[PDB]
Amino acid sequence: TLKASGSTAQANAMTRFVNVFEQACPGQTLNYTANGSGAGISEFNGNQTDFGGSDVPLSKDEAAAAQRRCGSPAWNLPVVFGPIAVTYNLNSVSSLNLDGPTLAKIFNGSITQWNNPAIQALNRDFTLPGERIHVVFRSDESGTTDNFQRYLQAASNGAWGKGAGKSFQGGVGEGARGNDGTSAAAKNTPGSITYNEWSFAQAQHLTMANIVTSAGGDPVAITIDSVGQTIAGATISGVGNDLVLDTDSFYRPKRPGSYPIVLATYEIVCSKYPDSQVGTAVKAFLQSTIGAGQSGLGDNGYIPIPDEFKSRLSTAVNA
């Protein structure tokens, strides 16, 4: 029975990954604590867990930390993609469009009302209400937050004016803990605006914003337009069975009807675990996770094929 913790973005998927795993390997299971990428790398580096789930790969300072943790180099192994929804709560509004620049101004607090003309210019077919916007952010160390702020940096033509990384840089709104804390609260706070992985926005039945793009597109999240994006992501950088991905192309696409806000969730593991028994259970799960465990179709986005012979080969090399 493995132990693991980390990103909440991969929490609904992991329920399927573990179930598939407990079927694949009868008598074996996995314990996942969904607590944020921040808590995922720290607990892995502290020799608390067997692998860690994180939407950001290790920085060079954490990579060394994991090397001492491991006695061997640590690998960033991506197993699922998470589209990042911009969820909102406006009664009778099922049709919202938002672009990078006005989505930056909302989350950095420059825009405080829903019928603000930047919001209204993008929404020509209906009148916005004169009511206040309630931004909801993540209060803990978060990979959804890192990726989402990087999208805002890339796609907002400077309107964001803030940094990225695992803590929210907006200076607006209120926090909640984990992807479940913000989806639940947004649903519960009228006027609310937040950012969630696709699975959380669905199971709470939150309206999701259509994102106006650099390409002259106006896409909803769907299978075809997330993949479209995912297509230009490179399984380079890493050297490597360390499949660190480059997704910088995601946030300013040129091919329309591509949906620009997408993260990948990594399992962070030891190339060689000090212990034989650990490195064997971690590889099984990950053989399964990338194998039968990759249906999705609903809440997440399965790993595409050009990446898979690289990934099957790196999971086959664990310990």
Centre a 10 Å sphere on the Cβ of residue 126 and count the other Cβ atoms it contains: 11
Cα 26 versus chain centre, distance: 30
Is 192 annotated as contributing to ligand binding? no
Query: Which candidate, 262, 263, 251, 264, places its Cα nearest to that of 215?
Result: 251
Rounded CA separation 298/300 (Å): 6
Residue 63 near residue 73 (C-beta atoms within 8 A)? yes
Is 55 annotated as contributing to ligand binding? yes
Resolution for the entry shown, Å: 2.3
Residue 273 near residue 172 (C-beta atoms within 8 A)? no
Amino acid letter, residue 86 = V
Is 144 annotated as contributing to ligand binding? yes
Supply the DSSP string of the chain, one letter for each residue: -EEEEE-STTHHHHHHHHHHHHHHSTT--EEEEE--HHHHHHHHHTT--SEEEESSPPPHHHHHHHHHHHSS-EEEEEEEEEEEEEEE--TT----EEEHHHHHHHHTTS--BTT-HHHHHT-TTSPPPS-B-EEEEESS--HHHHHHHHHHHHHSTTS-----SSS-----SEEESHHHHHHHHHHHSTTEEEEEEHHHHHHTT-EE-EEE-TTS--PPP-HHHHHHHHTT-EEEE-SSS---EE-GGGSS-SSSS----EEEEEEEEESS-SSHHHHHHHHHHHHHHHTGGG--SSSSBPPPHHHHHHHHHHHTT--
Query: What is the set of domains in the chain, with CATH numbers?
Result: 1-82+232-245+263-319 (3.40.190.10), 83-231+246-262 (3.40.190.10)
> Which positions ≥6 away from 66 have C-beta within 8 Å?
41, 44, 45, 58, 73, 74, 268, 270
Q: Is 177 left (phi over 0), alpha (psi -120 to 50) or beta?
A: beta
**Location of structure tokens 């493995």:** 2
Rounded CA separation 143/101 (Å): 21
What would the two tokens of residue 37 be?
């990428």
- 177-181 contacts: CB < 8 A, separation 24 or more? 177/138, 177/139, 177/140, 178/8, 178/11, 178/34, 178/35, 178/36, 178/138, 178/140, 179/8, 179/9, 179/11, 179/34, 179/138, 179/144, 180/8, 180/11, 180/34, 181/138, 181/139
Is 8 annotated as contributing to ligand binding? yes
Cα 88 versus chain centre, distance: 18
**Location of structure tokens 């996770």:** 289
Query: Which candidate, 23, 22, 31, 26, places its Cα nearest to that of 4?
Result: 31
Supply the DSSP string of 15-30, one letter for each residue: HHHHHHHHHHSTT--E
> Which positions ≥6 away from 283 have C-beta within 8 Å?
315, 316, 318, 319
Query: Which candidate, 119, 170, 128, places its Cα nearest to that of 149?
Result: 170
> Which positions ≥6 away from 275 have C-beta within 8 Å?
none
Centre a 10 Å sphere on the Cβ of residue 139 and count the other Cβ atoms it contains: 17
Is 104 annotated as contributing to ligand binding? no
Rounded CA separation 319/317 (Å): 6
> Which positions ≥6 away from 39 have C-beta within 8 Å?
5, 6, 33, 140, 141
Phi, psi for 35 (deg, rounded to 5): -135, 10
Is 184 annotated as contributing to ligand binding? no
Q: Tell me the sheet residues that pair with 32.
A: 4
Q: Tell me the sheet residues that pair with 268.
A: 52, 76
Query: Which candidate, 264, 229, 269, places its Cα nearest to that of 78?
Result: 264
End-to-end CA distance of the chain: 17
Is 50 annotated as contributing to ligand binding? no
Rounded CA separation 169/105 (Å): 12
- Per the entry, the structure determination technique was X-ray
Residue 46 near residue 38 (C-beta atoms within 8 A)? no
Cis, peptide link before residue 240, omega less than 30° from 0: yes
Cα 172 versus chain centre, distance: 21
Is 37 annotated as contributing to ligand binding? yes
What would the two tokens of residue 195 be?
């950012």
**Location of structure tokens 């825009």:** 111
Query: Which candidate, 278, 287, 291, 263, places its Cα nearest to that of 199?
Result: 263
